[PDB]
Enzyme design. Sequence first.
Site, PDB file in Angstrom:
ATOM      1  N   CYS A   1       0.698  -1.349  -0.059  1.00 12.86           N
ATOM      2  CA  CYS A   1       0.200   0.025   0.190  1.00 12.86           C
ATOM      3  C   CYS A   1       0.843   1.227   0.061  1.00 12.86           C
ATOM      4  CB  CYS A   1      -1.008  -0.092   1.309  1.00 12.86           C
ATOM      5  SG  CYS A   1      -1.828  -1.739   1.569  1.00 12.86           S
TER       6      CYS A   1
ATOM      7  N   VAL B   1     -11.655   5.248   2.559  1.00 13.74           N
ATOM      8  CA  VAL B   1     -12.858   4.691   2.686  1.00 13.74           C
ATOM      9  C   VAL B   1     -14.059   5.000   1.644  1.00 13.74           C
ATOM     10  CG1 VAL B   1     -14.638   4.229   4.426  1.00 13.74           C
ATOM     11  CG2 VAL B   1     -12.661   4.033   5.050  1.00 13.74           C
TER      12      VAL B   1
ATOM     13  N   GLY C   1       0.328  -3.448   4.131  1.00 13.59           N
ATOM     14  CA  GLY C   1       0.567  -5.136   4.762  1.00 13.59           C
ATOM     15  C   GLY C   1       1.910  -5.622   4.792  1.00 13.59           C
TER      16      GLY C   1
ATOM     17  N   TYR D   1     -17.469   9.948   3.531  1.00 13.78           N
ATOM     18  CA  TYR D   1     -18.133   9.907   2.722  1.00 13.78           C
ATOM     19  C   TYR D   1     -18.848  11.406   2.399  1.00 13.78           C
ATOM     20  CZ  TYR D   1     -18.429   5.103   1.039  1.00 13.78           C
ATOM     21  OH  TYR D   1     -18.351   3.642   0.509  1.00 13.78           O
TER      22      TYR D   1
ATOM     23  N   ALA E   1     -18.007  -4.153   4.281  1.00 16.43           N
ATOM     24  CA  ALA E   1     -17.401  -3.388   3.195  1.00 16.43           C
ATOM     25  C   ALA E   1     -17.815  -2.023   3.155  1.00 16.43           C
ATOM     26  CB  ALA E   1     -18.530  -3.964   2.056  1.00 16.43           C
ATOM     27  N   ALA E   2     -18.570  -1.475   3.743  1.00 15.50           N
ATOM     28  CA  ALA E   2     -18.832   0.007   3.720  1.00 15.50           C
ATOM     29  C   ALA E   2     -18.112   1.028   4.547  1.00 15.50           C
ATOM     30  CB  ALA E   2     -20.366   0.441   3.926  1.00 15.50           C
TER      31      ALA E   2
ATOM     32  N   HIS F   1      -9.028   2.903  -2.718  1.00 17.31           N
ATOM     33  CA  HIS F   1      -7.718   2.294  -2.505  1.00 17.31           C
ATOM     34  C   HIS F   1      -7.170   1.726  -3.648  1.00 17.31           C
ATOM     35  CE1 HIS F   1      -4.157   1.539  -0.204  1.00 17.31           C
ATOM     36  NE2 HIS F   1      -4.764   0.334   0.427  1.00 17.31           N
TER      37      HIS F   1
ATOM     38  N   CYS G   1      -0.209   3.271   5.909  1.00 16.57           N
ATOM     39  CA  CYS G   1       0.166   1.929   6.533  1.00 16.57           C
ATOM     40  C   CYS G   1       0.367   0.956   5.276  1.00 16.57           C
ATOM     41  CB  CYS G   1      -0.823   1.292   7.406  1.00 16.57           C
ATOM     42  SG  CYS G   1      -2.369   1.178   6.853  1.00 16.57           S
TER      43      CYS G   1
ATOM     44  N   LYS H   1     -28.400   1.721   4.877  1.00 13.13           N
ATOM     45  CA  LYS H   1     -27.967   0.351   4.482  1.00 13.13           C
ATOM     46  C   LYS H   1     -26.228   0.208   4.921  1.00 13.13           C
ATOM     47  CE  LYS H   1     -30.081  -0.589   0.021  1.00 13.13           C
ATOM     48  NZ  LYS H   1     -29.899  -0.821  -1.291  1.00 13.13           N
TER      49      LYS H   1
END
Lengths: 381, 381, 396, 396
Positions: free
Chosen positions: D89, D348, D384, D184, D246-247, D352, D382, D229
């Site tokens: 990343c 988010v 992985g 968002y 997921a959101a 990404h 950050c 949702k």
Amino acid sequence: SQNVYIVSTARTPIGSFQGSLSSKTAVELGAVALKGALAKVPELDASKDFDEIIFGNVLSANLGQAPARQVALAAGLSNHIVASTVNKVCASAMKAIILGAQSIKCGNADVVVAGGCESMTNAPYYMPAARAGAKFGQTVLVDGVERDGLNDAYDGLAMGVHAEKCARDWDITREQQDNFAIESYQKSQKSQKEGKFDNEIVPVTIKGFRGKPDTQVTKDEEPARLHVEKLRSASPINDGAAAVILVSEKVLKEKNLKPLAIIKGWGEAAHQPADFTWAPSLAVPKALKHAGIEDINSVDYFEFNEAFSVVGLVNTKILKLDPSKVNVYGGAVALGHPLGCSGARVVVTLLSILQQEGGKIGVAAICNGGGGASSIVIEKI
Amino acid sequence: SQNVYIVSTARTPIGSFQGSLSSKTAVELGAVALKGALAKVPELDASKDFDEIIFGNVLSANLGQAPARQVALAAGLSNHIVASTVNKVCASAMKAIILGAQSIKCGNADVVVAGGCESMTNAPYYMPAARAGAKFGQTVLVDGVERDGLNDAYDGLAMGVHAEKCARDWDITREQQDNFAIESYQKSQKSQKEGKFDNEIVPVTIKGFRGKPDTQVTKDEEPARLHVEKLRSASPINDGAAAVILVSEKVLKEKNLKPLAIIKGWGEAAHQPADFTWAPSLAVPKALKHAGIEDINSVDYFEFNEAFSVVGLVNTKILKLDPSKVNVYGGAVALGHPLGCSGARVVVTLLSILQQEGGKIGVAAICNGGGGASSIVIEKI
Amino acid sequence: QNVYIVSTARTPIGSFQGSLSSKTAVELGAVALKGALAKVPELDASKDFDEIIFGNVLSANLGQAPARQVALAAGLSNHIVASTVNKVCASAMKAIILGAQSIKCGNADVVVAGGCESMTNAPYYMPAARAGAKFGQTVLVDGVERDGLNDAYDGLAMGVHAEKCARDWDITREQQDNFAIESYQKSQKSQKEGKFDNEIVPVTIKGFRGKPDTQVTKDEEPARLHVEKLRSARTVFQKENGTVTAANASPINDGAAAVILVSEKVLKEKNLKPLAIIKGWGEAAHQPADFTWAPSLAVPKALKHAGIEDINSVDYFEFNEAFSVVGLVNTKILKLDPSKVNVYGGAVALGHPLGCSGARVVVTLLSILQQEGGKIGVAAICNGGGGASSIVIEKI
Amino acid sequence: QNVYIVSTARTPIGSFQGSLSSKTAVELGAVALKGALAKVPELDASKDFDEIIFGNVLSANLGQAPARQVALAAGLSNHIVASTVNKVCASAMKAIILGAQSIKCGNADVVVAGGCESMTNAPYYMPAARAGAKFGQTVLVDGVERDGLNDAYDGLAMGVHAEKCARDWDITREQQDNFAIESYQKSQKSQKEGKFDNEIVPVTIKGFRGKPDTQVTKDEEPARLHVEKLRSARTVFQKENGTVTAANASPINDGAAAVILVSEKVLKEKNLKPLAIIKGWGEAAHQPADFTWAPSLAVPKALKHAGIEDINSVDYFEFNEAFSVVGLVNTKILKLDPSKVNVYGGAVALGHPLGCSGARVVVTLLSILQQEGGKIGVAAICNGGGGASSIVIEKI
């Protein structure tokens, strides 16, 4: 050596490639068609009365062990049934009916399920190099529909390419083929509107996708998708299944069944693989001779599978048939061609034509890849 | 309604998995076996005399359009032949013979090629997700041998697993099964040494790999590879093909052919898919009844396919057979089991046994995945 | 600010589907790195290593962050800053250059550099799998070819461009074959005399089913020389009037190499003996098809950067021999004494694991300077895409 | 020796199988780079660009040397020195850091840095294809998961480790959802007001069969917010007592970003106006499972390196929001004013694309400093494997 009667028939709607039946396997479609046929003859008990199933299927890859066996057991038939799957490419399901009839005539069975099924959508890709390894360099993933279904084994050319060759060979123009295709679509759409397929068709339940409601596929998908300009300005790939129930005269009497038709005879022939499209002109005369029909004009209706326009045009010409007696509800060019099913589908539709249009004697015919054709003569009761 | 005679038989050697026949396709092996059989009956002309071919095959993926058709045409038979491929899993090639016999009895053919072929080595891997796409996350590449050949369609368990269940169900121990397997290997090796398979086997030409010399595969590969300690301390996967030529009595007289045997009768039966191993105990009595053999002791030799040790043990016990009359040259446990071929292979070997060991009446039997079994009774001339 | 090579190590170079086929690229990387770490116990694995920069070309199916995995599998602290670099064949040399720059800037005091590659275990790709093939045949792509061996612009193999180079500088089949034979013969002699013994750390192969573990201790390719077959070998890249063959080109190979770099500060504090000083480096590129003679552009830049104004002052040259033509052209263009070039042999005979070779040539160069009495050495490596990297080292 | 950001650009960020599905990672890279080059015509493409260092994680099926291809497709001279870097990343941020170091050492005067990624067009792998599967089923591996989203050591998704982080620092589903919604809403507002208009250069999509060409001009993900949702969305990584969904996690995405770096020397000779100065950078790592709060270790190191001794002197923070937990934890640990953090939203809501995001956050940070009247900014990301990278910039 003894009479063979059709006592029940049914078929699924024919789905388009990647279309309305995409979520169903070939076996599942087979079971639907067969359960549809069994329901019409409750005098025959599923747990005891059915001796044998012979079922057509071409693309057997990933269907699991013994597709015909699975179809029988999924439809609720006793596991005492003798099951076999037969492949004669496009003629598979017709060959199943013929083999069923032979089995009854020999006294080796009294009740036979015949028919066929196919999901060309869910035919997988193959990896020939996977087992031994590719080692180095690119390798090819083969489309099973092409390799085992649509392409000729000898020259690798699609059936549609050979249909074009046939048109050239018999001096049938592109425009003539297009005219006939378009005409066939319009006949198929009209027959649909007038409910001509309603008696033969049993619907397919489609499971709703994670909160979406379940639904039913009730009609043939291909006829409404005619595009004239596109056609004028090749392979019909489809999914579906069909089933017919055959019984001996003995059984017909003991169980008090209504016969729908009698199998008068059948004929099979072949020649050059590239010339499969006019192989029906060889099979039909053999069938008529086997049935004891001396005059071809005594036949009331003809159903050719007629997956390509040339098949309808050439075979009618060669056989000198009255075009008004031929494929009056349309053909596979418009309705679709699920390979392992179509051979029984033409017999199902032919019988419907005899019943609904006031015919007595009918012949069904289907050409197949490899250079062959199969044909059957039936007489309505 | 009329007598059916075997006039010629032949088979390839049986190759081991990824073994001596790895470079040959199922169709190529079919052609070898069939050409081997045709050579013995030159009175029958390839260009005119053969009406029909019915050929067994289970794993049809990537074989091309119409395997039986290809086999016939590759063997030099006329393209007028009526071709169909049949699948009854392990019993495929036996079912082909039965369907051929029925065809002759009905007067619809006078000369029929039956048999079968299989290359389990060259059965491909499938990718079910390839067409529509995997979208996200891992997907599985399916081994066609497992999915369509070796695994049961209902529970997904290998045939060998069901053979073990059967052993438990009939109180046959692991040690008994191993004893019988080992004994079968030693009988197969001895029969090989004494030239018992020499008359039935036709060799397979192997093309030499880029400067390496061409060679011939002349003998069954599996028997020499016995490993006792490994066995004591499941699926036999094989490649091969077999062919038999059937004629009516009429043809036998007009062409002045020597009959090798007469097909006295046949029987097919089925029950629970998991219990396929003792389905032959149901099929054999039906066959004997069909042949008009009232007493089972009048049979001189029995050939079961006997792909698993339990099949030999259970069916002999249930049928109360003299073990010295059963599988005297060994069985598939030692020789190998090419699925689409074995059904005709047992008939080929049975006939050799009748000729070489001084027998008159023989019965062949083969169980198949799905819960079925097929059986045929022959009488030597 | 001086950058010192303090330790080096490499695995043996395995043949394609050969002696190292059971090991992943990461596993080979760990072996080489642990081999290097073992020679400098003064540096503690759990505290003293600031950064790892590791070369790798075929990263498919290696898992997240190959260089990171190599560090952690070798027992280094998870505080290490890890990155993977790809410059095709020069990847591992670029890793050393980037490590040197990092030390030079004061960002790090101890850097692990090097590279690893398993061309054997590079997977096949299915581009159509995610969205679907729909209808008709689709291809399974060999990752070795697509991302390693083929040019991105015309799709032709490196060997096809080596043939172009042979034509453009009139180098014959005969010349290439003689260079190839020479490279094999030197490689065999060096092996015989133990010239690679300091460099190489062995790879343990797990014996499967109860057989004992076995050891890969030497480079696999050099023993395969058959001179007569070499001279009559078919031209693989060009059918008619070809010069390049399988035997006078580098093969496909597996392996790894590692070097440990430190600042002058760390050298004194930990009391380490330096093996060499990174005097300079140079990188250059031009037309993709002309990658074979890109080292002739890179070398002059490195010498300028190092403060070497006469090329004859350098004692030994290590050019990666991706092809016999690469060795011949660059020696001719730079007008070098051929007896100073690749004295232990090269990649035509030893193998060419893409992501590793860039550090492998530095590892071998250093051994040559120590064992053959050289002080100044330059390593050079061409790469697919038209580039080359070069580094100048001086023995201490 | 000062390093100046002279130009920046990025593509819109496309959704998984979305608006940029027809473009490769290389093609997206070229678009972003050409967008950046266009803003500084004083720099000539055929002569002035010494080096390209470009981030990319999923290199499978991109062809030889992705960074090289990006440079050449953007019309840069084939004399450019090209390398591809992977730090998962943080790849693209690492590319900027390595570019800065290169300028600082005097090796280069003009460096292209950035990154690109097409997670859509990352292929499936077949590990068993080369040697053969032999018997029994074998798996087709999704490259996105294997090399991008899953931890190399335990095989678990980044989202599983985000859940661990939520548990260890007691951050609730509610908190994460509210952070997600906030991200968002900010993202939508910024889009509405044209805050991304300077940054973004559009991607032309070829119309197939005679339909006209279409244009992707904005980020695809922000418009998908449905608050109700979002609040009742299922927990995807942990079935029972889960927080991450997921959101409130970053999606899978396609995109690219590019920045142009120059020395003080070039700045004066070509008469370029500098946008920002690279004040410093910091990189750190620890346990792989704890990657989510690795930025809290990296940021202090960067501030120290830049000569900022009070954290409150920085005007704006850009943390890559791989998950809602990442934004929440690192703000809490560093004890930062949340109103200074991700003021235009974050990953988010924006997406990404792994190999791109590291430069994307710098691109956006710079825009924030220009448009919101900030001088000092820090970007952090950050990655992985347990790492994080951070960079401090000052607007000119």
